[PDB]
């Protein structure tokens, strides 16, 4: 984001005091092989 | 309730209540605002005083505001194809 | 993977069916009550499922009064069944 | 006896499996209240910590010390 | 049937208690389905082809009603996620809540089962268990009186009196007339719910008592107008006077206490700048009166149903609340007009 | 949102294996105060953004405990560690005999 | 390949296509085996092994088994082929075109719908949870309890007493 | 006699004996320690997650 | 992943070699001799039956109802082989979060195998005869669920790996003494021929004989075990094979010795005789970990 | 958002499947099982994602009352096949 409108600040929440897990749903979009291994507690189970 | 339950307990209905052992709710902190905001009848009939604390609480369960934001990043990441793209990991 | 374990069993089972077929070249309403009793008892067993699973942490004085109570009504249902059940 | 001696030996002769259905299930209800042994099982059940321990900030408080071995808190030592 | 008939009857009484004394959304869900398992054996009773057809038509409409209601419960987890019966918090879940409760009641679009279910009931004891059953969906509607849209409740209340007022004109079956007065009265029930939730509970009190007085006086076996005709001369003439007090009260007549709902439903609505709707209520209510107009002529006139066979032995039915309740059903408009406060 | 800087995370961490840490619960007795300071910080202030300097003291004290085992009684500790990994998921059963060899060496020290 | 839940959810609706269509109760009975068994996997992917296996024990180990009896009691012997049946295939073809045509719009993440909610990515936010707990956790480690919910145990027991008594009075 | 019956048991002492040995001997090839760990509860899975984070990036079970 | 293939092919050989042991043990129980003309001691007959029944033996269709008749062997053979997966043979193939829940469910899903085969034939006499055989399988799964829930309530969770740890010095036969007799009868449920009897014929009972070995190993874990020993997996497996096969002989014993119960009286064994006994024990097994401390 | 676009769609498809008929009354009760199955999955996802722990018992109770209707209504279906030959929607007497 450099040419758009998003500042990438303040976050989605309007409270800006609590701040939950946040990167539970995010956990970096890049490299899908690492994301699939991270969310596989029930699946495979090794 | 049409008939109230006086001198007897059979609730355990609302979220962020008495835990089975000690297990927390996913939106525990947000209802600590919401129940404390709307314990009186002031924002129950009007529902305007606790609008700020409700929008963040609706954001906790659905995550729609983050969903639109992450889609905007992913689309712009796809826009960088055959352009000035870089991947640190 | 669990899907890798499942599919390999089913594909070899269907493979035996291919060998089985391609390779060779040349009323009574009384039995319904059984299915009724079975399905109604399943749910009482389903409610009695978490017994060696929830007793580890929860209070015993509160549980024991309720745990036996489900088995009591599971036998009380059978006590009503004894008075004229059937010839089968 | 009118039915204590009469309607017991008849139950042994005519379907004695029904004797087991009332006696064993009967002992399952009466014995837990009578026995002075149920108190020990409740003690260890509450003592077993599944969740992580929480430290409280003390300002003039008794029966609380450091994490090291000291004469403080509950800490059940029922039969080693 | 011995004790088991009373136990089944007590579980409908207990079933509505779970609906009444509640806070959890799945708790009322159980309360509705506790009734579903318990009405069906009384629906059957006398081993009839009509009873089998009525119960299957009753179940398949009301089982779908509960599953539509459970959808509204699950959307209440999709948004907000609070399991307390107070508000729906959704413009979508409120639609699937009101329409599901309309299925269990005799409201406009889901009314088709009501006359054919009432016909298949073997006895007068089972006929009460539909008028008393309507207390259960009404109790939930009182709890969720806000957050529910006017455009899909008031339209269902207006249409129900229209279809109720034309739905008994081409009918002679005594069960069918009572089934369409049920559809007619439900329009007067839900019309109050936005304009103060009070008086809806009192509208139940008047309706449930007045309907129970009918079937307890129908203990002398009658299924049609022509079968209730042979009652003036062959049977007791004082019984025709007391049914006259219940026939005329069901329609809008001020000397009788069946005008006591039509007193306050119009009064509370006119307070909130709405006049065009209460006009439409009262005019269509005359069509509801018109069924009883032709049904009063079965008792007031001779009508020639003599029959050669004459009864000498006096009739001995149950008649449990057949004496205490019609005295309150005939006159209470002069007795307690302040009862609005006492009930709600 | 404003998160912490890139050079906020403490150096020298996660050098020990998963079961190597689980082998010794003496870490609960010795070096317990800095662990309890971070624990009390978390229940008072739920955010990880404020309680990170206390966590730097946790990572520093953890290395001080393990280096003592690296210097003295390395032989009975590694033998106990090879025993604890050889078993399935029992993690304490079938290793009590080599647990007797442990603690006895450590008894010479404090 | 990358998706886990979304691929199984399509097969879940595909089973229900055979319910909107009426291909005789025998072939419709096969729907509860396909959509039910896959329906376990949708529950199992988010966690909670106990609740996912409840469909295996009751729906697949009782419910449809008893429904297998009534198919033999009434409307039995032979099921008519759905290819020969009129409008049954018409309901089947219109049923799939409400789902398969939609999936093409779900491609490129976001999609327009009748409801306000959008599709999204469904790969990184598919689990929607980080670490949360540790021992006896995952929300359904201690799932069902007789403690606290003592009232719910009684009322379930009442309805199951009703069921045995009532069906005996019907038949 | 039992020179006929027991060979019918001895052949079962091979084929039914295979699944017990095959599941045990396979951990020699999969792991350098003859062990595979099962999660059961999220705590033991996180230990396996950080074991892949330490030293061996691809391998789950590794020393130090 | 070669282990799955090492739990299908040698497993099907154990089903194939079962037909010899069923003919030889029952043979010696009847003073006749087992197979001898075929091989050295008749050991070459299980492969000889496989060539006979599959290759040249055809199928004359009664009706062949399109989807069925070919679908029923998939529910038979497929579900019987999936049961082998969570079994705690030293270290199981992908150990389940809950062991016995997968064990009870796939056995209750195996009821369809005899149900779909009843639909496979057009004749009414076949399906009425089929539903009667379903009625036996459907009823004894209630007792199968109860006895399991009372054995686990003594010690261990639903995990099959914890059932080995509880039997460190003492078997579960002695604390569950009436249940040991009860579980042995309830295992005779999936058309075992000992209590009562009702694609091609060959592969259909290849799943039915597989379920007999399945229950034989399931008895050898829930009631037997002796020890575990993580140091040597060999010492457990040799000891397990003797314990499992001694129970396999006992299923060939009940079939040999005892006649059919009369279908009605077999249904009188349940509800009237078995269910009042098992529920009273279920009541008793609730109180035991509360009376004396023992809730693992 | 992602999964809820299919399981809600499966509910609406089954909602059509109930009220649409081709004379078979067995198929309607079969769809009532599917309706409860679709309600089971939709409830499971809402409770499992947002870690409630207490509400996990509720779909188990819902599963019990799913089978309560889909047996007692199924018993009435048998009574239709006792009075009449074969179960059909067209075969009725009520007016």
Could you tell me if G42 and A43 are in contact, meaning their C-beta atoms sit under 8 angstroms apart? no
Q: Which residues of C touch B (CB under 8 A)?
A: 57-58
Chain C residues near residue J75 by CB distance under 8 angstroms? 32, 36
What is the structure's resolution, reported in angstroms to one decimal?
4.1
Tell me how far apart the alpha carbons of residues I295 and I157 are, in angstroms, rounded to a whole number: 10
Tell me how far apart the alpha carbons of residues F100 and B26 are, in angstroms, rounded to a whole number: 44
Q: What is the DSSP string of G15-71?
A: HHHHHHS--HHHHHHHHHHHHHHHHHHHHHHHS-HHHHSHIIIIIIIIIHHHHHHHH
Could you tell me if C75 and I276 are in contact, meaning their C-beta atoms sit under 8 angstroms apart? yes
Asked if the Cβ–Cβ distance from F32 to D54 is below 8 Å, we say no
Could you tell me if I83 and I214 are in contact, meaning their C-beta atoms sit under 8 angstroms apart? yes
CATH code of the domain containing G160: 1.20.120.1200
Strand partners, E173: E224
- Radius of gyration from C-alpha coordinates of chain C: 23
Could you tell me if I137 and I111 are in contact, meaning their C-beta atoms sit under 8 angstroms apart? yes
Asked if the Cβ–Cβ distance from A26 to B66 is below 8 Å, we say yes
> Is G104 at the interface with chain E, CB within 8 A?
no
Q: How many helices (H) and strands (E) does chain G have?
A: 8, 0
* Cβ-based neighbour number of residue E327 at 10 Å: 12
> Is G124 at the interface with chain B, CB within 8 A?
yes
Tell me how far apart the alpha carbons of residues I113 and I121 are, in angstroms, rounded to a whole number: 14
Q: How many domains does chain J have?
A: 1
Could you tell me if E140 and E194 are in contact, meaning their C-beta atoms sit under 8 angstroms apart? no
Tell me how far apart the alpha carbons of residues E33 and I28 are, in angstroms, rounded to a whole number: 60
Long-range contacts formed by F87-92: CB under 8 A, 24+ apart: F87/H35, F87/I230, F88/H35, F88/H37, F88/I91, F88/I161, F88/I230, F89/H37, F89/H38, F89/H40, F89/H44, F89/I161, F90/I165, F90/I230, F91/F19, F91/F22
- Spell out the residues 6+ positions from residue E4 whose beta carbon is closer than 8 angstroms to its own: G165, G169
Tell me how far apart the alpha carbons of residues G157 and G167 are, in angstroms, rounded to a whole number: 16
Classify residue J92: in a domain, yes or no: no
Could you tell me if B71 and G120 are in contact, meaning their C-beta atoms sit under 8 angstroms apart? yes
- Name the method of structure determination: cryo-EM
Q: For an interface test with H, which of I47, I89, I163 has the most H Cβ atoms less than 10 Å from its Cβ? A: I89
- Spell out the residues 6+ positions from residue D58 whose beta carbon is closer than 8 angstroms to its own: D64
* Cβ-based neighbour number of residue B49 at 10 Å: 14
CATH code of the domain containing J67: 1.10.287.3510
Tell me whether residue E83 is exposed, middle or buried, using C-beta atoms within 10 angstroms of its C-beta: 0 to 12, 13 to 18, 19 or more: buried
CA dihedral sign of residues G146, G152, G158, G159: negative
CA dihedral sign of residues E139, E145, E151, E157: positive
Q: How many domains does chain G have?
A: 1
> Is A42 at the interface with chain G, CB within 8 A?
yes
> Is B28 at the interface with chain A, CB within 8 A?
no
Q: Identify which of A24, A36, A43 has the shortest CB distance to residue G129.
A: A24
Task: Match 């002796």 to its residue by tokens.
Answer: I226
CA torsion, ordered D20, D24, D26, D28, to nearest 10 deg: -160
Domain that holds residue G119: 3-168
* Cβ-based neighbour number of residue C12 at 10 Å: 17
Chain B residues near residue J53 by CB distance under 8 angstroms? 19-20, 23, 25
Task: Match 């075969």 to its residue by tokens.
Answer: J91
Q: Identify which of A21, A27, A42 has the shortest CB distance to residue G124.
A: A27
Superfamily of domain C6-83: NADH:ubiquinone/plastoquinone oxidoreductase, chain 3 (1.20.58.1610)
- Radius of gyration from C-alpha coordinates of chain D: 25
Tell me how far apart the alpha carbons of residues J42 and G55 are, in angstroms, rounded to a whole number: 14
Chain A residues near residue F49 by CB distance under 8 angstroms? 19
Asked if the Cβ–Cβ distance from C88 to I8 is below 8 Å, we say no
Q: Which bin fits F47, alpha (ψ -120 to 50), beta or left (φ > 0)? A: beta
Chain H residues near residue A39 by CB distance under 8 angstroms? none
Long-range contacts formed by E77-82: CB under 8 A, 24+ apart: E77/J43, E77/J46, E77/J47, E78/B61, E78/B62, E78/J4, E78/J46, E79/B58, E79/B61, E79/B62, E80/B57, E80/B58, E80/B61, E81/B15, E81/B27, E81/B61, E81/J46, E81/J50, E82/B14, E82/B15
Looking at CA atoms only, how far is residue C65 from chain I in angstroms? 10
Chain I residues near residue H18 by CB distance under 8 angstroms? 6, 10
Domain that holds residue J10: 2-84
Tell me how far apart the alpha carbons of residues E7 and E15 are, in angstroms, rounded to a whole number: 12
Looking at CA atoms only, how far is residue J76 from chain G in angstroms? 8
Tell me how far apart the alpha carbons of residues I200 and J13 are, in angstroms, rounded to a whole number: 38
Looking at CA atoms only, how far is residue A4 from chain G in angstroms? 18
- Radius of gyration from C-alpha coordinates of chain E: 20
Phi, psi for D57 (deg, rounded to 5): -75, 120
Could you tell me if J21 and J86 are in contact, meaning their C-beta atoms sit under 8 angstroms apart? no
Looking at CA atoms only, how far is residue B60 from chain G in angstroms? 11
CA dist E119 → E44, E184, G102, J75 (Å): 12, 18, 46, 21
If we measure between CA atoms, which residue out of E235, E241, E247 comes closest to residue E294? E247
Assigned token pair, E287: 């069509």
Strand partners, E224: E173
Q: What is the DSSP string of D12-71?
A: HHS-THHHHHHHHHHHHHHHHHH-TTHHHHHHHHHHS--SPP-----SS-SS---SSS-S
Q: For an interface test with G, which of I85, I109, I131 has the most G Cβ atoms less than 10 Å from its Cβ? A: I109
If we measure between CA atoms, which residue out of I173, I198, I170, I174 comes closest to residue I184? I173
Assigned token pair, D35: 């026995």
Classify residue J80: in a domain, yes or no: yes
The yes-or-no reply on I/J contact (3 CB pairs or more, < 8 Å) is no
Q: Identify which of I280, I286, I290 has the shortest CB distance to residue D20.
A: I280
- Spell out the residues 6+ positions from residue I151 whose beta carbon is closer than 8 angstroms to its own: I172, I176, I179, I183, I222
Q: Where exactly are the structural domains of chain C? A: 6-83
Phi, psi for E173 (deg, rounded to 5): -70, 125
Tell me how far apart the alpha carbons of residues B69 and B59 are, in angstroms, rounded to a whole number: 13
If we measure between CA atoms, which residue out of E108, E28, E12 comes closest to residue E70? E28
Tell me how far apart the alpha carbons of residues J95 and E271 are, in angstroms, rounded to a whole number: 42
* Cβ-based neighbour number of residue I149 at 10 Å: 22
């Amino acid at each position: 984001v450099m040419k758009x409108x998003x500042x990438x600040x303040x976050x989605x929440x309007x409270x800006x005091x609590x701040x939950x897990x946040x990167x539970x749903x995010x956990x970096x979009x890049x490299x899908x092989x690492x994301x699939x291994x991270x969310x596989x507690x029930x699946x495979x189970x090794x | 309730q049409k008939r109230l339950g006086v001198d007897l307990d059979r609730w355990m209905t609302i979220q962020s209540a008495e835990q089975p052992h000690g297990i927390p709710s996913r939106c525990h902190a947000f209802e600590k605002e919401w129940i404390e905001c709307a314990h009186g009848i002031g924002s129950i009939r009007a529902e305007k005083e606790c609008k700020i604390e409700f929008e963040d609480f609706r954001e906790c369960l659905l995550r729609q505001k983050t969903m639109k934001r992450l889609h905007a990043i992913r689309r712009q990441r796809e826009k960088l194809i055959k352009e000035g793209k870089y991947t640190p990991p | 993977n669990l899907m890798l374990a499942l599919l390999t069993n089913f594909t070899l089972a269907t493979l035996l069916v291919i060998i089985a077929f391609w390779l060779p070249q040349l009323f009574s309403m009384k039995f319904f009550l059984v299915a009724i009793t079975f399905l109604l008892f399943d749910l009482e067993i389903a409610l009695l499922l978490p017994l060696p699973w929830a007793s580890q942490t929860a209070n015993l004085n509160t549980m024991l009064t309720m745990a036996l109570f489900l088995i009591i009504l599971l036998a009380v249902s059978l006590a009503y069944e004894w008075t004229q059940k059937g010839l089968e | 006896a009118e039915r204590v001696a009469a309607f017991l030996k008849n139950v042994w002769a005519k379907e004695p499996v029904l004797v087991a259905s009332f006696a064993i299930a009967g002992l399952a209800v009466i014995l837990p209240t009578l026995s002075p042994y149920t108190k020990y099982s409740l003690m260890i059940n509450x003592x077993x910590x599944x969740x992580x321990x929480x430290x409280x900030x003390x300002x003039x408080x008794x029966x609380x010390x450091x994490x090291x071995x000291x004469x403080x808190x509950x800490x059940x030592x029922x039969x080693x | 049937n011995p004790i088991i008939f009373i136990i089944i009857l007590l579980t409908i009484m207990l079933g509505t208690i779970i609906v009444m004394i509640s806070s959890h959304w799945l708790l009322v869900w159980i309360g509705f389905e506790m009734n579903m398992l318990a009405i069906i054996p009384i629906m059957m009773k006398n081993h009839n082809p009509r009873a089998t057809e009525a119960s299957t038509k009753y179940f398949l409409t009301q089982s779908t009603a509960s599953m539509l209601l459970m959808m509204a419960v699950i959307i209440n987890l999709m948004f907000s996620g609070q399991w307390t019966v107070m508000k729906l918090f959704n413009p979508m879940a409120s639609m699937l809540m009101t329409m599901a409760l309309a299925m269990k009641l005799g409201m406009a679009p889901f009314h088709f089962w009501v006359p054919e279910v009432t016909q298949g009931i073997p006895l007068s004891s089972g006929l009460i268990l539909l008028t008393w059953q309507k207390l259960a969906p009404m109790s939930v509607l009182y709890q969720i009186f806000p957050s529910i849209n006017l455009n899909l409740i008031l339209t269902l209340s207006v249409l129900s009196i229209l279809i109720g007022g034309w739905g008994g004109l081409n009918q002679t079956q005594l069960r069918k007339i009572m089934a369409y007065s049920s559809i007619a009265h439900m329009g007067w029930m839900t019309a109050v719910l936005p304009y103060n939730p009070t008086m809806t509970l009192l509208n139940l009190i008047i309706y449930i008592i007045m309907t129970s007085t009918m079937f307890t006086m129908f203990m002398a076996n009658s299924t049609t107008t022509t079968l209730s005709l042979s009652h003036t001369w062959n049977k007791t003439p004082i019984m025709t006077v007391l049914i006259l007090a219940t026939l005329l009260s069901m329609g809008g007549l001020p000397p009788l206490s069946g005008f006591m709902p039509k007193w306050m439903i119009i009064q509370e609505m006119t307070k909130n700048n709405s006049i065009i709707l209460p006009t439409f209520m009262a005019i269509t209510a005359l069509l509801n009166l018109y069924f009883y107009m032709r049904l009063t002529y079965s008792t007031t006139l001779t009508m020639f149903p003599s029959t050669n066979n004459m009864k000498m032995k006096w009739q001995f039915p149950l008649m449990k609340k057949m004496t205490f309740l019609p005295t309150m059903v005939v006159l209470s408009t002069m007795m307690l007009p302040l009862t609005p406060m006492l009930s709600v | 949102e404003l998160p912490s800087l890139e050079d906020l995370k403490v150096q020298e961490v996660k050098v020990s294996s998963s079961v190597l840490k689980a082998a010794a619960h003496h870490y609960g007795a010795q070096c317990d105060k800095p662990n309890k300071e971070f624990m009390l910080c978390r229940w008072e202030e739920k955010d990880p953004r404020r309680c990170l300097e206390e966590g730097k003291l946790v990572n520093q004290c953890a290395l001080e405990f393990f280096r003592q085992i690296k210097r003295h009684c390395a032989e009975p500790f590694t033998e106990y560690w090879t025993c604890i990994d050889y078993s399935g998921l029992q993690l304490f059963r079938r290793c009590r005999k080599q647990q007797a060899q442990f603690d006895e060496c450590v008894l010479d020290k404090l | 390949m990358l998706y886990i839940v979304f691929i199984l959810s399509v097969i879940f609706v595909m089973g229900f296509v055979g319910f909107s269509s009426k291909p005789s109760p025998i072939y419709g009975g096969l729907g509860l085996i396909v959509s039910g068994g896959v329906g376990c996997g949708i529950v199992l992917n988010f966690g909670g092994s106990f609740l996912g296996l409840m469909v295996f024990l009751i729906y697949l180990g009782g419910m449809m088994v008893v429904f297998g009896y009534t198919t033999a009691m009434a409307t039995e012997q032979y099921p008519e082929i759905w290819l020969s049946n009129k409008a049954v295939l018409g309901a089947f073809v219109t049923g799939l075109l409400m789902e398969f045509f939609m999936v093409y719009y779900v491609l490129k993440d976001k999609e327009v719908e009748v409801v306000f909610e959008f599709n999204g990515l469904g790969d990184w936010v598919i689990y929607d949870t980080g670490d949360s707990g540790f021992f006896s956790e995952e929300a359904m480690g201690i799932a069902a309890l007789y403690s606290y919910g003592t009232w719910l145990v009684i009322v379930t027991g009442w309805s199951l007493l009703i069921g045995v008594v009532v069906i005996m009075e019907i038949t | 006699m039992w020179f006929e019956v027991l060979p019918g048991i001895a052949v079962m002492g091979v084929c039914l004996f295979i699944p017990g040995m095959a599941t045990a001997r396979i951990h020699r090839f999969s792991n350098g320690g003859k062990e595979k760990r099962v999660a059961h509860y999220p705590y033991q899975w996180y230990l396996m997650e950080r074991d892949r984070r330490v030293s061996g990036v691809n391998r789950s079970y590794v020393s130090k | 992943m070669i282990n799955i293939l090492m739990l299908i092919i040698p497993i099907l050989l154990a089903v194939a070699f079962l037909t010899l042991v069923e003919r030889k043990v029952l043979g010696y129980m009847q003073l006749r001799k087992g197979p001898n003309v075929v091989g050295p001691y008749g050991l070459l007959q299980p492969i000889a039956d496989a060539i006979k029944l599959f290759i040249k033996e055809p199928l004359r269709p009664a009706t062949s109802s399109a989807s069925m008749f070919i679908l029923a062997p998939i529910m038979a053979l497929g579900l019987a082989l999936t049961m082998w997966i969570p079994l705690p043979m030293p270290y199981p193939l992908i150990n389940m979060n809950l062991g016995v829940l997968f064990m009870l469910a796939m056995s209750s899903l195996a009821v369809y195998s005899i149900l779909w085969s009843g639909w496979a034939s057009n004749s009414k006499y076949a399906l009425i005869g089929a539903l009667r055989a379903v009625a036996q399988t459907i009823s004894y799964e209630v007792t199968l669920a109860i006895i399991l829930l009372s054995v686990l309530l003594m010690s261990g969770s639903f995990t099959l790996s914890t059932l080995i740890t509880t039997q460190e010095q003492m078997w579960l036969i002695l604390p569950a003494w009436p249940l040991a007799m009860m579980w042995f009868i309830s295992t005779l449920a999936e058309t075992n021929r000992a209590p009562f009897d009702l694609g091609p014929f060959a592969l259909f009972f290849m799943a039915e004989y597989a379920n007999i070995i399945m229950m034989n190993i399931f008895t050898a874990i829930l009631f037997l075990g002796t020890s575990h020993n993580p140091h040597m997996p060999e010492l457990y497996t040799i000891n397990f094979t003797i314990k499992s096969l001694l129970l396999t002989m006992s299923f060939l014993w009940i079939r040999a010795s005892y006649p059919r119960f009369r279908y009605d009286q077999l249904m009188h064994l349940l509800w009237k005789n078995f269910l009042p006994l098992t529920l009273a024990l279920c009541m008793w097994h609730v109180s035991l970990p509360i009376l004396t401390s023992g809730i693992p | 958002s992602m999964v809820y676009m299919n399981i809600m769609m499966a509910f609406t498809v089954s909602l059509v499947g109930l009220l649409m008929y081709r004379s078979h009354l067995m198929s309607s009760l079969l769809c009532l099982e599917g309706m409860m199955l679709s309600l089971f999955v939709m409830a499971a996802l809402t409770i499992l994602n947002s870690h409630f722990t207490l509400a996990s018992m509720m779909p188990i109770i819902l599963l019990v009352f799913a089978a309560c209707e889909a047996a007692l209504g199924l018993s009435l279906l048998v009574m239709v096949s006792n009075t009449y030959g074969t179960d059909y929607v067209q075969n009725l007497n009520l007016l």
